[PDB]
Design a binder for this molecule. Structure first.
Ligand SMILES: COc1ccc(S(=O)(=O)N(CC(C)C)C[C@@H](O)[C@H](Cc2cc(F)cc(F)c2)NC(=O)c2ccc(C)c(Nc3nccc(-c4cccnc4)n3)c2)cc1
Ligand SMILES: [Cl-]
Ligand SMILES: [Cl-]
Ligand SMILES: [Cl-]
Ligand SMILES: [Cl-]
Ligand code: NA
Lengths: 99, 99
């Protein structure tokens, strides 16, 4: 698709069998999702946003579908205000910015 | 142009007679710039994201040039970690996300 930006670029994702809403976010290096259960071990990560820092749980090699496009990669889990799909997964789905 | 997302999508902007580097940010509703002076009226606002909220000054009807493309709109000024070009100005330069 070609997604214009008059509204938030929200898509459906599928992670852990479940559908969620998420924001396609070119300003995010990494993908950050609200609290949920994921398999395997996690590693610590601190990320900084507009208001300060939050600790998240880093899960690697997670299967995740974004707007119907299959990806496998890192997902950060923690107290984000909204689910955000960052560049690590935008690159897997072949997304670019165009003007 | 077509901008890939292997790295942060940074561009040069001109705002208030100054050159700055800023991130093209589809996850940002509004444009947020580090502390600077702008002409005209403003009003206070709180904006939120990862890590909580910051207080900003809202200036309306500000001209900007984003990677060579002019537009006009609201600019929020305050203690953002990164200068952000949000959707309110990305729409005006015709930016889309494509995959
Ligand atoms: C109404 O208008 C507005 C309201 C809110 C905003 S916003 O809050 O800016 N935001 C809203 C979304 C979160 C929904 C836009 C979003 O793209 C922001 C833009 C941003 C990037 C950044 F980068 C630092 C910042 F403030 C801000 N993304 C993240 O916060 C972001 C997204 C993902 C990650 C992983 C990180 N943090 C990060 N990334 C890599 C490394 C580190 C790091 C590593 C080691 C030490 N410290 C930091 N942190 C940050 C904008 C306009
Ligand atoms: Cl739109
Ligand atoms: Cl990844
Ligand atoms: Cl505006
Ligand atoms: Cl349009
Ligand atoms: Na004004």
């Amino acid at each position: 698709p070609q997604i214009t930006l008059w509204k938030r670029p929200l898509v459906t994702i599928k992670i852990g069998g479940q559908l969620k809403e998420a924001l396609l976010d070119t300003g995010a290096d990494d993908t950050v999702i609200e609290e949920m259960s994921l398999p395997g071990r996690w590693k610590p990560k601190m990320i900084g946003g507009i208001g300060g820092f939050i600790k998240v749980r880093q899960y690697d090699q997670i299967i995740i579908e974004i707007a119907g496009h299959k990806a496998i990669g890192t997902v950060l889990v923690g107290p984000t205000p909204v689910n955000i799909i960052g560049r690590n997964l935008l690159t897997q789905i072949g997304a670019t910015l165009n003007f």
